[PDB]
Amino acid sequence: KLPKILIVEDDERLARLTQEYLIRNGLEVGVETDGNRAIRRIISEQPDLVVLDVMLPGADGLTVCREVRPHYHQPILMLTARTEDMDQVLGLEMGADDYVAKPVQPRVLLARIRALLRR
Amino acid sequence: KLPKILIVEDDERLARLTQEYLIRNGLEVGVETDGNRAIRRIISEQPDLVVLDVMLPGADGLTVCREVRPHYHQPILMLTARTEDMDQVLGLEMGADDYVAKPVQPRVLLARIRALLRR
């Protein structure tokens, strides 16, 4: 019974490299590349945590966060190249539990996932 | 009754400026400057959230986290100049809920406190 992680990320290669790392570290990990699909997928599959980019086709990650929250109470970790102070504050106030600038070192991302899961 | 924040910071001036900002934003805020005193104070006063520096006289932030965690279950936000990957991992893995590099924009710090307090 491993924790289930959904990575929502438009860069398919980045998403997959991140997925492989996290799988090697005791997690069950899926990848979604589109924001509208992510909304449906997060709600139906109910992952234990979402790793979410703000920059997504279909629906941006802030919209994903907004739409998903009334039906999804689990941790959302925003992981993005949108690193401005304004962007960070918006993500967190929109309902994200953490907000991490790309690029992130895999070991750090793992530590953050773990910390969020014990919440 | 406002949420109770304890800032644990050796730089007395930095601590106070952060404290003033946070009070202006609907928080009751105290300041502690020593790690040994922080351990005692966190356990007895039970603040709603601790803002904790790694670099502290008496007991460092990692030691503080270790010592309070059996008796203190509220969010700990580590906020420090100790910015290396290994430092983040260590902080998070021993019970800190967030780990933030100095300097942090005041509104970003507030957004992170607010996100932590939501759980």
Distance CA A59, CA B70 (A): 42
Structure tokens given for B28 = 């009751």
Q: Is B75 exposed, middle or buried (0-12, 13-18, 19+ CB in 10 A)?
A: buried
What is the enclosing helix (H) or strand (E) of A118? helix A106-118
Cβ contacts of B79 within 8 Å, gap of 6 or more? B9, B51, B52, B53, B99, B100, B102, B104, B109
* A88 in reach of chain B (CB within 8 A): yes
Number of independent structural domains in chain A: 1
What does residue A38 show for φ and ψ, rounded to 5 degrees?
-55, -45
DSSP codes joined into one string, chain B: -PPEEEEE-S-HHHHHHHHHHHHTTT-EEEEE--HHHHHHHHHHH--SEEEE-S--SSS-HHHHHHHHTTT--S-EEEEES--SHHHHHHHHHTT-SEEEESS--HHHHHHHHHHHHH-
Instruction: Report the distance separating Cα A103 and Cα B50, nearest Å.
Output: 28
Burial environment of residue A13 by CB neighbours within 10 A (0 to 12, 13 to 18, 19 or more)? exposed
Burial degree of A30 (CB within 10 A; 0-12, 13-18, 19+): middle
CB of B84 within 8 Å of a chain A CB? The answer is no
What number of C-beta contacts closer than 8 Å exist between A and B?
Answer: 41
Range of the domain at A9: 1-119
Phi, psi at residue A113, to the nearest 5°?
-60, -45
Burial degree of A37 (CB within 10 A; 0-12, 13-18, 19+): middle
- Render the burial of B27-50: b for 16+ CB within 10 Å, e for the rest: bebebbbbbebbbebbeeeebbbb
Resolution in angstrom units: 2.0
Please name the method used to determine this structure: X-ray
- In 3-state terms, what secondary structure has residue A18? helix
Q: How far apart are CA A86 and CA A84, in angstroms?
A: 5
- Sign of the Cα torsion B93, B101, B11, B78 reads negative
Residue B78 counted as an annotated binding residue: no
Distance of alpha carbon A5 from alpha carbon A30, whole angstroms: 6
Q: For residue A88, give the H/E element and its range.
A: helix A85-94
For B117, nearest residue in chain A (alpha carbons)? A97
Mutation to test the A interface, candidates B97, B104, B110, B114, most A Cβ within 10 Å: B97
Using CA atoms, how far apart are residues A83 and B72, in angstroms rounded to an integer?
32
* Inter-chain touch B92–A105, beta carbons under 8 Å: no
User: Cβ of B107 and A85 within 8 Å?
Assistant: yes
In eight-state DSSP terms, residue A3 is P
A residues 26-65 closer than 8 Å to B (CB): none
Instruction: Report cis status (omega within 30 of 0) of the bond before B103.
Output: yes
Q: How many residues belong to chain B?
A: 119
A96 chain-B contacts, CB cut-off 8 A: 115
CATH of the domain at B28: 3.40.50.2300
